[PDB]
């Protein structure tokens, strides 16, 4: 019955400040090492601080310097990472964990950190119709461009959920312009063109936005 | 703090993951796996995973592979003020070759409506994963205006997908006439290119 819920992740400004949290469940902090750790995208892990048990010494990555703080409240059963003068190269999913004595053998659900100067802004959603090119033997490519949203994710989904067979939601990438863009696309039968409807769900939570795109040939 | 190093396996085979390390001789390890969309899991060795130290270098074998063992792999090393994850490997699923099904779809009128466009190329359902993609425009070869994206080895046929997306101004889409992704990939024995013509 052992849980990490982490919280505090979002959207800050180069040089601004941020403070996360990590809520331990069927055990204290106190009793363990607990240790911060974060995965930009695409790329491997990254071990960034570290507390340890019954005295509360701390050890952090060099990467980090004297900008992050870790600590711990026993009472409240929690530990935090404060971030202070954030950098672009801070963006990324931060994981805490509990350390067993050995490894780290619970981890949290990971909360997102991003840095930027860019501003929140819900996607536009373009369709990608099918035609006589999208075909060739019998199956159809169709989709949704989701395009110049801020800050990550996107979630996407097909005619409520129903359809998830063909379907393919690649990663989102981050244009020069400091705006992601991601496209989903599903292969369907040619002759379900006439009949079936096509409809992609885009949820844009950091801007609550919600979008439905009909595509149509 | 850089990509996985990839490695293709079958089911059966064995595998030994070397840690690289650094100034270590009283340094202690710790193997994870993590699957896409996951947080990291321990892993507990001794049955099918087994680890030792041979000199400064830590190693991880798997002595029969698993298809649930198909993951990224990631030692970590902790001594006296140090402590740090390896670069990662990521094991993925050999299989057959498959070629790619090309598709290009023009900018949305909706998009060129709204001031902008983007054209999009689709490879579909291909392995290994390794593809150029490479956009010409009036047949001229095109570089920097252009990004890509590839999904995780899919569940069903243990393949890839990659999306391109170029990227251009309104006006400068509409005074170029044809436009193509060439597609180069292991199944082709010849390079696949899909066009069209703006407006037809
Ligand atoms: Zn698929």
């Known amino acids: 019955e052992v849980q990490l819920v982490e919280s505090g992740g979002g959207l800050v400004q180069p040089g601004g400040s941020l403070r996360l949290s990590c809520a331990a469940s069927?055990?204290?902090?106190?009793?363990?090492?607990i240790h911060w750790v974060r995965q930009a995208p695409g790329k491997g892990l990254e071990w960034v601080a570290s507390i340890s048990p019954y005295y509360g010494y701390t050890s952090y990555a060099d990467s980090v310097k004297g900008r992050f703080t870790i600590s711990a409240d026993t009472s409240k059963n929690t530990a935090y990472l404060q971030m202070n003068s954030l950098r672009a190269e801070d963006t990324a999913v931060y994981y805490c964990?509990?350390?067993?004595?050995?490894?780290?053998?619970?981890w949290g659900q990971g909360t997102l950190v991003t840095v930027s100067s860019a501003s929140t802004k819900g996607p536009s959603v373009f369709p990608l119709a099918p035609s006589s090119k999208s075909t060739s033997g019998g199956t159809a490519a169709l989709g949704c461009l989701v395009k110049d949203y801020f800050p990550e994710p996107v979630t996407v989904s097909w005619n409520s959920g129903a359809l998830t067979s063909g379907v393919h939601t690649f990663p989102a990438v981050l244009q020069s312009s400091g705006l992601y863009s991601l496209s989903s696309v599903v292969t369907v039968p040619s002759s379900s063109l006439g009949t079936q409807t096509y409809i992609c769900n885009v949820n844009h939570k950091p801007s609550n936005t919600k979008v439905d795109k009909k595509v149509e040939p | 703090t850089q990509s996985p190093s990839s490695l293709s396996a079958s089911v059966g085979d064995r595998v030994t993951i070397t840690c690289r390390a650094s100034?270590?001789?009283?340094?202690?390890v710790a193997w994870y796996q993590q699957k896409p969309g996951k947080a990291p899991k321990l892993l507990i060795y001794s049955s099918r995973f087994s680890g030792s130290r041979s000199g400064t270098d830590f190693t991880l074998t798997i002595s029969s592979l698993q298809p649930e063992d198909f993951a990224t792999y990631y030692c970590q090393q902790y001594s006296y003020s140090l402590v740090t994850f390896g670069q990662g490997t990521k094991v993925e699923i050999k299989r057959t070759v498959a070629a790619p099904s090309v598709f290009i779809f023009p900018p949305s009128d909706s998009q060129l409506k709204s001031g902008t466009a983007s054209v999009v190329c689709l490879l579909n359902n291909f392995y290994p994963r390794e593809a150029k993609v490479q956009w010409k425009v009036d047949n001229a070869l095109q570089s920097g205006n252009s990004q890509e994206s590839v999904t995780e080895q899919d569940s069903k046929d243990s393949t890839y997908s990659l999306s391109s997306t170029l990227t251009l101004s309104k006006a400068d889409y509409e005074k170029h006439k044809v436009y193509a992704c060439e597609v180069t990939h292991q199944g082709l024995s010849s390079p696949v290119t899909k066009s069209f013509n703006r407006g037809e």
């Open positions: 069927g055990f204290n902090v106190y009793y363990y090492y």
């Open positions: 964990a509990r350390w067993s004595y050995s490894g780290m053998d619970y």
């Open positions: 100034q270590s001789v009283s340094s202690a």
